[PDB]
UniProtKB/Swiss-Prot annotation:
This protein's name: Nucleoprotein
Keyword Transport listed: no
Originating organism: Sendai virus (strain Ohita)
Extra facts: Most abundant protein in the virion. Since the viral RNA genome consists of 15,383 bases,there are 2564 molecules per encapsidated genome.
GO cellular component, one term: ribonucleoprotein complex
Record-listed RNA binding positions: 178, 188, 193, 258, 348, 352, 354
Residues of the full protein shown: 3 to 414 of 524
Gene label: N
Entry keyword annotation includes Ribonucleoprotein: yes
Length: 412
RNA sequence: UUUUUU
């Protein structure tokens, strides 16, 4: 009643101050990026794969400007579509850069640059063509090479060019999985993510990115928010509901299911361990303002729609409010609960200036305690006999010692 | 600011 205004002030203040300015938008500074699409002249699968590998090798070049490397990655991702310019128009609209679409055209008469020529409408460019299809020194190998490994040409005549292009593009997306939010665990995380695809057969051994390629692609993604926006846009605006989804689009949706909520790890896990567990420690007043904050944050997330999982890799305006430093006691509690209840969360960096050590240790204590972690909420539905309740406590005691041992917060 | 897993 009287205290209703204070309880709803977090949600009301967030709605009141996050209202967008609106009106006309002043355009800012944007780089002009050359994106190369394949014209109908390039009907050779081998030529198409060579162009894809050239795009990938140009993206990796250190000397090339990051925006241009991002445009080579954009070219590569547009190769997956029959109309690449339609793809760039629907998913390529951003204020970060202006995409200048060039066409790669294959001419039998011209053997000057591998039978290729870059032409925009009537005009044809040779300076750009020698730059793009010229001999470029690879700082590091583009793909991993192993003994007794099927060659790409053999793999391309056996598995179609869609399969090879899908391998390459899926791997670019797998890079995005951790390029932005975990830049130090990008190589390990890439090969961990890539392991499912390799067993699946989506990525064959001849087209598996090297670590250097993964590091190079991740740097371009960290610098180019336009490329990340195009990928996030492709994931959101893709018509997943329609059954007719290309193997590549299906795999991109898999990778994007891995990209969802990157950077929001603490928000998601705070909800999962701090409030979803529903332990008696939630009755503390330390967590009450942070529970209100998290309630408003859930509304902010669920209002952001399908782009809510990407607010942190996209550097969204509201993304900084999902930072745990806005709900540090509830976050520390949930982090304690999570390091006890989840093995994987013990490698999550919880050693932070705002880690409430008493809330952290309290989460560990209630998560480790049999009386604390058993709820009567579901006992009526389950029809639990008192012998079973006592039996459950006996099982918990045997399964976990909980002899006053705490998890130290993992540092960065 | 980010950082686990999937």
């Amino acid at each position: 009643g009287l205290l209703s205004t204070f309880d709803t002030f977090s949600s009301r203040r967030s709605e009141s101050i996050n209202k967008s300015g609106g009106g006309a938008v002043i355009p800012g500074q944007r780089s002009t990026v050359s994106v190369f699409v394949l014209g109908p002249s390039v009907t050779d699968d081998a030529d198409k794969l060579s162009i894809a590998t050239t795009f990938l090798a140009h993206s990796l070049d250190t000397d090339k400007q990051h925006s241009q490397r991002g445009g080579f990655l954009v070219s590569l991702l547009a190769m997956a579509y029959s109309s690449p310019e339609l793809y760039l128009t629907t998913n390529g609209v951003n204020a970060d850069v202006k995409y200048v679409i060039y066409n790669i055209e294959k001419d039998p008469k011209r053997t000057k640059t591998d039978g290729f020529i870059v032409k925009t409408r009537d005009m044809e460019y040779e300076r750009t063509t020698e730059w793009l299809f010229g001999p470029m020194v690879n700082k590091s190998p583009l793909f991993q090479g192993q003994r007794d490994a099927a060659d790409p040409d053999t793999l391309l005549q056996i598995y179609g060019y869609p399969a090879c292009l899908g391998a390459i593009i899926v791997q670019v997306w797998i890079v995005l999985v951790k390029a932005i939010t975990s830049s130090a665990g990008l190589r390990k995380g890439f090969f961990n993510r890539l392991e499912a695809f390799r067993q699946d057969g989506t990525v064959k051994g001849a087209l598996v990115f090297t670590g250097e390629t993964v590091e190079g692609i991740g740097s371009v993604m960290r610098s180019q928010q336009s490329l990340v926006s195009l990928m996030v846009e492709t994931l959101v605006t893709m018509n997943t509901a329609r059954s007719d989804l290309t193997t590549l689009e299906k795999n991109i949706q898999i990778v994007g299911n891995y990209i969802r909520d990157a950077g929001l790890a603490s928000f998601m896990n705070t909800i999962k361990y701090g409030v979803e567990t529903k332990m008696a420690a939630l009755t503390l007043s330390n967590l009450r303002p942070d529970i209100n904050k998290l309630r408003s944050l859930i509304d902010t997330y669920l209002s952001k729609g399908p782009r809510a999982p990407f607010i942190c890799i996209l550097k969204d305006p509201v993304h900084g409010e999902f930072a745990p430093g806005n709900y540090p006691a509830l976050w520390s509690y949930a982090m304690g609960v999570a390091v006890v209840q989840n093995k994987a969360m013990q490698q999550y960096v919880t050693g932070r200036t705002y880690l409430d050590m008493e809330m952290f240790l309290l989460g560990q204590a209630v998560a480790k305690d049999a009386e604390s972690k058993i709820s009567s909420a579901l006992e009526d539905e389950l029809g639990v006999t008192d012998t079973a309740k006592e039996r459950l406590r006996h099982h918990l005691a045997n399964l976990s010692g909980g002899d006053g041992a705490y998890h130290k917060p993992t540092g960065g």
